[PDB]
Amino acid sequence: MEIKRFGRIREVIPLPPLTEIQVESYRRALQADVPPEKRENVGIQAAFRETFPILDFLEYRLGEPPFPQDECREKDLTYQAPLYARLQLIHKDTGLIKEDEVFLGHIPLMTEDGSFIINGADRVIVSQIHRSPGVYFTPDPARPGRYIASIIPLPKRGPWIDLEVEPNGVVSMKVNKRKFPLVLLLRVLGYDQETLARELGAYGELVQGLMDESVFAMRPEEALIRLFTLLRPGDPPKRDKAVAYVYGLIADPRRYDLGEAGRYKAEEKLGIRLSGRTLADEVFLPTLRYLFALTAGVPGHEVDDIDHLGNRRIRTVGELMTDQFRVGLARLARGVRERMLMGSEDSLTPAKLVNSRPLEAAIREFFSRSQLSQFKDETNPLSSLRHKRRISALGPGGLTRERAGFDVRDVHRTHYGRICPVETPEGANIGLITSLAAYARVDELGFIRTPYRRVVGGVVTDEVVYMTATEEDRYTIAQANTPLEGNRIAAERVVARRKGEPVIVSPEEVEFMDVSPKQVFSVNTNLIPFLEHDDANRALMGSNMQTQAVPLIRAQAPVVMTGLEERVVRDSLAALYAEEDGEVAKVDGNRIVVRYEDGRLVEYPLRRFYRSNQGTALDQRPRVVVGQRVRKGDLLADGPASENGFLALGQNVLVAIMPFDGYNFEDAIVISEELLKRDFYTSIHIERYEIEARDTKLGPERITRDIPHLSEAALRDLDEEGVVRIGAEVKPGDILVGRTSFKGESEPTPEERLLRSIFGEKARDVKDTSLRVPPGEGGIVVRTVRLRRGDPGVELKPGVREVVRVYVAQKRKLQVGDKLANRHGNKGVVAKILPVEDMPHLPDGTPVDVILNPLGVPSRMNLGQILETHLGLAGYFLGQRYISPIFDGAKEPEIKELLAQAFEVYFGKRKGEGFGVDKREVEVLRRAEKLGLVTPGKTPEEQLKELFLQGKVVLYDGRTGEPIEGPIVVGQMFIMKLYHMVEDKMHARSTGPYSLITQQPLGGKAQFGGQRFGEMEVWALEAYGAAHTLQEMLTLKSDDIEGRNAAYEAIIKGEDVPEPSVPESFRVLVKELQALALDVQTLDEKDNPVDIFEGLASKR
Amino acid sequence: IEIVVRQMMKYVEVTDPGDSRLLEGQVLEKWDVEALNERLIAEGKTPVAWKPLLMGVTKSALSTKSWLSAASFQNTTHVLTEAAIAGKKDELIGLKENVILGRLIPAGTGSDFVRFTQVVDQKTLKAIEEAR
Amino acid sequence: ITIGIDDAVIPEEKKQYLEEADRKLLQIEQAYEMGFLTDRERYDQILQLWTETTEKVTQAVFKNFEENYPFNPLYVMAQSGARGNPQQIRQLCGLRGLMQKPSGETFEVPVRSSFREGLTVLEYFISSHGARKGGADTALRTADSGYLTRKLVDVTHE
Amino acid sequence: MVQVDGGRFATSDLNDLYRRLINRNNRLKKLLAQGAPEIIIRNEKRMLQEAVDALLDNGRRGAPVTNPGSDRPLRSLTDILSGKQGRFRQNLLGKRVDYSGRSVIVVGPQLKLHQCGLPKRMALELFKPFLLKKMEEKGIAPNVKAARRMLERQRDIKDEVWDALEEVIHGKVVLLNRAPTLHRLGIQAFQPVLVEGQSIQLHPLVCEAFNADFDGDQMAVHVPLSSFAQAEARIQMLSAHNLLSPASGEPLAKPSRDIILGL
Amino acid sequence: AXXXXXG
Amino acid sequence: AEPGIDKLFGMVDSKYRLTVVVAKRAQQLLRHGFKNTVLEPEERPKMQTLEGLFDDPNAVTWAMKELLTGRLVFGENLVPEDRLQKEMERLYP
Amino acid sequence: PVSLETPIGDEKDSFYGDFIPDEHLPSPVDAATQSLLSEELEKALSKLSEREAMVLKLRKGLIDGREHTLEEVGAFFGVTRERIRQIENKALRKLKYHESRTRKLRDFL
Amino acid sequence: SDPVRQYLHEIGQV
Amino acid sequence: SMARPVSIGEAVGIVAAQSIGEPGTQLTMRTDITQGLPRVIEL
Amino acid sequence: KKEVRKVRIALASPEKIRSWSYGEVEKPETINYRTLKPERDGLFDERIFGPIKDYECACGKYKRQRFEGKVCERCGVEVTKSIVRRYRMGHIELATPAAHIWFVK
Ligand SMILES: [Mg+2]
Ligand SMILES: [Zn+2]
């Protein structure tokens, strides 16, 4: 097939590496491929440089991972490299100098896609956004009059500085709780009124505010000592130590670290040069004079915007990892503190001093339990991409709910080209979780930059500059869609933006121009064709649902593409590509072996039917046969959810947009049975079950094919060990693994003991704990993994003898209740599956696949789906696909043209085969010209062409054989099946486990937890005035014991449900109050105490 | 909205304690105050002088005769200390109390109006005379 | 009843209505250059202008449907009360209208484009602000629903 | 005090408070008998007071007491009664129900106003205890334990059983609920019509009251047990017995969407 | 992430 | 829905009265196994089985259908409870 | 020991001990099957001679909760220790016949 | 408050 | 809910609270005089 | 038999406090690590709060429901349902009286 591309806008540059944000970060963090002597000071090197000397640091190296990635996933081991550190011990006055290479533990390694393996699960470290270090001006919310200065260093490094003016006229300063005049600290910096006269006096009436008689007239050391009266009470000044705490507060690089990016912020805002990241002096003077300057209404002086992306820094994986590493290292040095004294002073090795436990615990904590470390989204490749490109405002060192108001969440004018306006969660995380823009890049300073073309006068160049949010404000930037003839602007009025405002300018005024619209949106957002016709609200939903797309066996790439589809699969590395020009020797399901021009023989194993975190099957299907010529960049094997290297998130189907008998009512969807026949929307899902055999004090838990009370009927599918056989079809209740455990301290109930003898000694030491298939679940057994204690290479948690795992697969066909969605945000569940004869059909007899309700269009205002439908129809009959860029896409004239071109295939061959127009088509056309869709007097041949140009055809109702009055829109729409599936979502409970303490219904392995009945439901029942029903909800169905047992018993016997005993919710209350020494009595009408405990509580 | 606003006007503040056990400036439900004045003027004792009071829903909830209800809402340790020292006996007037206990709510089919209703077939209709 | 892209019918009037809006803008612009108007006055006049024109365009769309296409699907769904309100119908056929700035003030320049015509990338970005605000608004409203109902049950339950 | 997987024990924080209280009381009695100086006796009396406090209300006075290895305050009786997801606060979130269930909803257009489509597989579990007795009444099972063992496997489900379930649910109704329940009509009673498939079929007209749409909303189902509860549900709560808004007095169940459109 | 189920 | 619901509503001064009455009558019909019914054989509520028409298993349907005939007598304090119980157990064991 | 009332998940909505099931108390199913078990046991057990029934009651520990040796039951009734064994076996055989006949107790297992 | 300090002071008296 | 005098035993306080509260979710959170839900709670 | 129409909350005299408790917990011991059983006079002691197993005493002398309310002469454990361990109150006798912090703070 041929793919017709649209749009007049040419992209000067390609899209950057998509996982770049995750990979480069950890690259510059670890510096493993950079030799120790040439290592720049950053990341691990930085933490090492800061924590040492305490014992001094020389270098470090990263060894090779003890196990490969796949084995790490399999055995539940963290994929990591050993961290060795070469250090030396300094003997003072002993003259001795020795050294050691110490093993500090392992550092988790990042894969090629940018994920991690932590204890076997794939984890992603989500990039966190916060305020960049530097100097800002709030201003003061309390007094609207003036502004507050703020000096902010790195999060765990240094204190918080605030400068404010009170009615006393004196300039205050904030450290911790206490505020004191900074005029005292000024003297300590070596400053006198003489230098504070000229330089700082220029601003009107801003000088004498910091002039105070007593303290300013004091010598530097006098003021220095005086500061300690303010800093801490009861501490003797100790003026030699007075240098220690002051240095540590400000002048010390080790304790106080202002960000390197924050250093840059300081240099840029104040317009100075810092010799280091240390405040002290150099910073205080310009910070002050700048404060008074902004106070004085002086040119080029701005109040900082906190949500401006110039002031918003993004700390990536390397940053966070380096932080926790620094913490663990500081705790290690904290161990060295107490370990560098106790015992022998004269003799010890650096190895004897160093305990690497704090470091290992810190890093393992950061990967296992951190809020930014989470289960990878493996549902498809695209989801795995997005999860890496996600930005969180939450987590340690950032906002939380209630700490986040409308202000933090709103899309800033500087989010353009930087953060996607469209893609965010709908819930309580809205605006806090955002995804990086497509073209967007992140420098070491941690700022998001956007590409811009540079223009000279009325001429546009190919030079592309990457500017940050602050730098963007400086210029006047015209849009990318502005008419361009060759390299020069062709319009008199050129639409542009200054400071994030829509300013209309002239060509010569223009400075920079946008590259492509694609820069201003996310990747997910970019996959939506005709986006410009979609309201941002539904578009959001499209962007979000695309990652919820489950890979289909038959999955197709969309008939209408934005053009990113290919590169998405490329950069997600789900698929195999040709590394070098060559020819392929061997091809089959499990491998592809190729030979290149260099005579290199290489065997690429294919991952087949592999269970992801979310249970979707990740399956690679080879697209190339034996003895084929491959070129570098050519696709060898399709990954999950990709068709010929293009992203395949669903199927393209024939949609008719009409109401159908209320089955498409309220966003419900109607589908044709045909879809199931050809296995459209059929996905492979792999459930993973596990069972453990542990040693109880009662005895060992045995995993065995021998289960008491079980016939051979139930056991037939189990092997010798008791495990089920590979390939067996298991329904709910069938045993996956047999197990036996000792019952009730080897105490049988006497009533049981005799009936066991009646039947010939069925009495036994063990009971059946075997793992069965939970209700509603099951499928065909695929893999099994058994691990035991006392066997090579295998060790598990304390107490457990062995562990079995059964990986079951099931191929789910589309069914009623499953969630389908297009990329335009139209979503719904299949409420009906119609037999093909019931479907609406074209005059050539072809039935439609899906019937979409038109009422879904007007209120949601996503028209991109209608155009996708039209263009899809054209491409259905023309046997072609399209690429329609965002905002650059196919225009209604072009679409109508392609429709006219397809109308020849559709209606043209009708005459060639000896057929005219139906009498029914005549009727429809009459009604159509009555409605005004077709010009009266023209031939039906032409009238139908007019209708078809509007994207509407004549449909026949398959049930009545009569036509649907008036024409109906039909066409190819790309629709996805979503991870939400009715099979996983159904639950039911009669009875089951109850909580130990609370005695409320609890979730079992084979049993459902029951629905929680909340206060609002209580209100509903009260309002209804149904007392008894509510009572049941509060008693028998809940925590009450006597009554639930008696009720079940009654229903079983056929007797009506008995009156409720008191619920445990009340009893436990009463007793809690009694434990609080408060008598709670339940009185009679006569005020005579009544026993709610049904006896048993009464002494004697 | 009328029912809610009426619940805001539920409470009054006594200026003159009268012949009852009440003190000056003590907030009390107008229903109970008019009840005490209905009991005391059925005596001939001097009436209690109360000032009408408006408080928002939060406070009009927080201050209530029922300690079971007041317990859930806020600062329950205080509600409970106060309830205990005074030995407050909570008749279960409202719904919240009854659901806390699990007893049938005083509404709908749990209302004493229709609850005690009895049904008898016409065969046992004439079995009342033979039994008497 | 169905929805094709041609069922969103832009009234011809939209052109005229918009053209007049441009000339009437120049008058407001020149009056600023001479010093007759202050910043706030020209701002208020521009917003007033675009509001008037927007309402006019809505009226134009619906009068159009009423006279020349009584059975049009959008118009029918709207009038019947089946689906859609005049504001949405407007955003499909007539102009989108004035988007709100992130600070809460109105943007000076509106969105001339309808949803059929398709938005400019800039216009889209501008609308995204109001989009976000509405999003967090609905998010909060659903975040606690029954807050008020709880407060009210606490007083009225007995 | 309960043992979990492995050899580890899980137990309440209360026990530690009780313990330290006891230790201090006993050491006090001992120090009294030994005739110790009033200094030590005072100290122990004080520590005893503090211990009784921390037991009753932890952290309210002085520093909160914590077990070594963690900075979390031990949860005391006051905390238990209220304020950290407390008794009175836990009774806001609600208690789970025994006969409940949940699934995804799809449109029910063929349903009459008083009916709702209920998945067979789901209904079976919901009505199971009634179903056993109906299996006894019929010739499908000798006894309760028998029928119960008969339903334990899906492959062992007879085609006679569904005919019995149809008898169980005859005349009965179930409650459907969609969260959030904003007003009372957010819970309504329908008589179930057994259907193949895993989805609950919902009447279109009741969608407005429920604020339910078909984009993947799920609804909970509940079973009234008592003949009383059943009665209440069938007169007071029946979907077709509330046609008008209890708020505005105007009809809540009314033509909408496609219906209006066609008419 | 919540609302009417985008995420 | 259910036949004659409005009339059942008309028979009482409160809906919840009707609910209590129907419920209690259902309990009566269940405990005594439907032999105490005021309904004649042709008035008996029927259910459609595979075999044929059988007695409707539902006690509430029965109670309502009886109440609609007006043959039942309801109200507060008609008789003492225990006497009613013993009389009913004597008439229908 | 691990503390109950420990936060479970990333939220404070749950405590650890909330998820711990109660294996000690009988399920509504269990207690019912158990009561029916006793009912059906003493239904067919007491329908024979009370002597040979009491033999099984004493020896299997149905009463007093302890299994009595043949000597003790033989001391209670007065017969020989072998006689109590023979009547126990004929009682058990009688119960086997009654079981194969009525199929009542076949299902508890 | 801080009974350790209290008691340690009482001890400091002796 | 029916058109006729309310039946005695009605839950009517609860019905009131729901009746007011349910649409409350449709009242605007963001705006001299308070508007929407903030005004409703102000009253 | 007679339903509860009221709920009263008053203070508790030590007289009233002890009228509750089935014994004094005299020891700061929970259970024994080896036997996994309540220590004598400890927080979990069966002698006070009742039987861990239903209708069975600690030592195991009386295992049948036939003895109910019968307290063992050996282990001193009443023979009843274990449900009473959810209910039965214990207590602690204080050397010096202590103020209830609810009323003080
Ligand atoms: Mg929904
Ligand atoms: Zn004993």
Numbering used by the authors:
A (entry chain C): 1 to 54, 66 to 291, 300 to 1119
B (entry chain D): 1368 to 1499
C (entry chain D): 947 to 1104
D (entry chain D): 527 to 789
E (entry chain I): 1 to 7
F (entry chain E): 2 to 94
G (entry chain F): 314 to 422
H (entry chain F): 78 to 91
Study text:
DSMZ 13491. GE inhibits both Gram-negative and Gram-positive bacterial RNA polymerase (RNAP) in vitro, but does not inhibit human RNAP I, II, or III in vitro. GE inhibits RNAP by binding to a site—the ‘GE target’—that overlaps the RNAP active-center ‘i’ and ‘i+1’ sites and that includes coordinating ligands of the RNAP active-center catalytic Mg2+ ion, Mg2+(I). Binding of GE sterically precludes binding of initiating NTPs to the i site, i+1 site, and Mg2+(I), and thereby blocks transcription initiation.
To define the structural basis of transcription inhibition by GE, we determined a crystal structure of Thermus thermophilus RNAP holoenzyme in complex with GE at 3.35 Å resolution. Figure 3A shows that GE binds to the genetically-defined GE target, confirming the hypothesis that the GE target represents a determinant for binding of GE to RNAP. The structure shows that GE occupies the RNAP i and i+1 sites and makes direct interactions with the D2 loop, the link region, and an RNAP Asp residue and water molecule that coordinate Mg2+(I). The sidechain of βGlu565 penetrates the GE macrocycle and makes interactions with six of seven GE residues. The experimental electron density and inferred bonding patterns in the crystal structure define the stereochemistry at the five previously unassigned stereocenters of GE, as follows: D-dmaDap, D-Ser, D-Val, 3R,4S,L-dhGln, D-aThr, D-iSer, and L-Ama. GE binds within a shallow bowl-like depression formed by the D2 loop, the link region, and the Mg2+ loop [Mg2+(I) and three RNAP Asp residues that coordinate Mg2+(I)], and the H and I regions. The GE dhGln residue participates in a network of interactions, including H-bonds with RNAP βGlu565, βArg678, and βLys1073, an H-bond with a water molecule in the first coordination shell of Mg2+(I), and van der Waals interactions with RNAP β′Asp462, which is one of the three RNAP Asp residues that coordinate Mg2+(I).
